[PDB]
Amino acid sequence: MADGGSERADGRIVKMEVDYSATVDQRLPECAKLAKEGRLQEVIETLLSLEKQTRTASDMVSTSRILVAVVKMCYEAKEWDLLNENIMLLSK
Protein backbone atom coordinates (compact mmCIF):
# COMPACT_ATOMS: atom_id res chain seq x y z
CA MET A 1 0.00 0.00 0.00
CA ALA A 2 2.27 2.74 1.34
CA ASP A 3 5.37 1.11 2.85
CA GLY A 4 6.12 -0.18 -0.63
CA GLY A 5 6.49 3.42 -1.70
CA SER A 6 8.65 4.12 1.34
CA GLU A 7 11.08 1.31 0.59
CA ARG A 8 11.11 2.13 -3.12
CA ALA A 9 11.91 5.79 -2.45
CA ASP A 10 14.63 4.92 0.06
CA GLY A 11 16.15 2.50 -2.44
CA ARG A 12 15.88 4.85 -5.41
CA ILE A 13 17.20 7.98 -3.70
CA VAL A 14 20.70 6.51 -3.88
CA LYS A 15 20.62 6.06 -7.64
CA MET A 16 18.83 9.39 -7.98
CA GLU A 17 21.82 11.08 -6.36
CA VAL A 18 24.21 8.93 -8.40
CA ASP A 19 22.58 7.97 -11.70
CA TYR A 20 21.08 10.18 -14.38
CA SER A 21 17.90 12.21 -14.12
CA ALA A 22 16.39 10.02 -16.85
CA THR A 23 15.69 7.55 -14.02
CA VAL A 24 12.61 9.76 -13.53
CA ASP A 25 11.09 7.76 -16.37
CA GLN A 26 11.33 4.51 -14.42
CA ARG A 27 9.67 6.23 -11.47
CA LEU A 28 6.90 7.92 -13.46
CA PRO A 29 4.80 4.89 -14.46
CA GLU A 30 4.84 2.66 -11.38
CA CYS A 31 4.04 5.70 -9.26
CA ALA A 32 1.17 6.73 -11.54
CA LYS A 33 -0.71 3.47 -11.02
CA LEU A 34 -0.16 4.01 -7.31
CA ALA A 35 -1.72 7.44 -7.77
CA LYS A 36 -4.47 5.74 -9.74
CA GLU A 37 -5.09 3.41 -6.80
CA GLY A 38 -6.50 5.74 -4.16
CA ARG A 39 -7.45 2.66 -2.14
CA LEU A 40 -6.40 3.98 1.28
CA GLN A 41 -6.58 7.37 2.97
CA GLU A 42 -2.83 7.96 3.38
CA VAL A 43 -1.57 5.61 0.66
CA ILE A 44 -2.12 8.10 -2.14
CA GLU A 45 -1.10 10.82 0.28
CA THR A 46 2.27 9.14 0.68
CA LEU A 47 2.43 8.31 -3.02
CA LEU A 48 2.02 11.93 -4.06
CA SER A 49 4.24 13.06 -1.18
CA LEU A 50 7.13 10.83 -2.17
CA GLU A 51 6.75 11.47 -5.90
CA LYS A 52 6.69 15.21 -5.24
CA GLN A 53 9.69 15.15 -2.92
CA THR A 54 11.73 13.01 -5.32
CA ARG A 55 10.81 15.19 -8.30
CA THR A 56 11.76 18.26 -6.27
CA ALA A 57 15.10 16.71 -5.35
CA SER A 58 15.84 15.92 -8.99
CA ASP A 59 14.76 19.43 -9.94
CA MET A 60 17.03 21.04 -7.37
CA VAL A 61 19.98 18.89 -8.42
CA SER A 62 19.42 19.78 -12.08
CA THR A 63 18.78 23.49 -11.47
CA SER A 64 21.89 23.61 -9.30
CA ARG A 65 23.60 23.02 -12.65
CA ILE A 66 22.40 24.42 -15.99
CA LEU A 67 19.39 22.06 -16.16
CA VAL A 68 17.14 24.59 -14.44
CA ALA A 69 14.67 25.86 -17.01
CA VAL A 70 14.94 23.24 -19.76
CA VAL A 71 13.69 20.53 -17.38
CA LYS A 72 11.46 22.31 -14.83
CA MET A 73 8.88 23.09 -17.52
CA CYS A 74 8.83 19.42 -18.49
CA TYR A 75 8.60 18.35 -14.84
CA GLU A 76 5.64 20.61 -14.09
CA ALA A 77 3.69 19.94 -17.29
CA LYS A 78 4.19 16.22 -16.78
CA GLU A 79 3.04 16.50 -13.18
CA TRP A 80 -0.19 18.16 -14.29
CA ASP A 81 -0.61 15.52 -17.00
CA LEU A 82 -0.03 12.77 -14.42
CA LEU A 83 -2.66 14.50 -12.31
CA ASN A 84 -5.00 14.22 -15.28
CA GLU A 85 -4.06 10.57 -15.89
CA ASN A 86 -4.32 9.76 -12.20
CA ILE A 87 -7.52 10.72 -10.40
CA MET A 88 -8.68 14.09 -11.62
CA LEU A 89 -8.27 17.22 -9.49
CA LEU A 90 -4.78 16.30 -8.23
CA SER A 91 -5.86 12.81 -7.19
CA LYS A 92 -7.97 13.45 -4.06
> CA-CA distance, 2 to 18, in Å (whole number)?
25
Amino acid (1-letter code) at residue 54: T
Q: Distance between CA atoms of 22 and 83, rounded to whole angstroms?
A: 20
Experimental technique used?
cryo-EM
Q: Report the C-alpha gap between 2 and 41 in whole angstroms.
A: 10
Q: Which of 18, 5, 1 is nearest to 50 (CA)?
A: 5
| Resolution in units of Å | 3.8
- Of 2, 37, 21, 13, nearest in space to 78 by CA: 21
Closest CA to 46 of 88, 91, 16: 91
What is the sign of the dihedral through the CA atoms of 49, 36, 88 and 44? negative
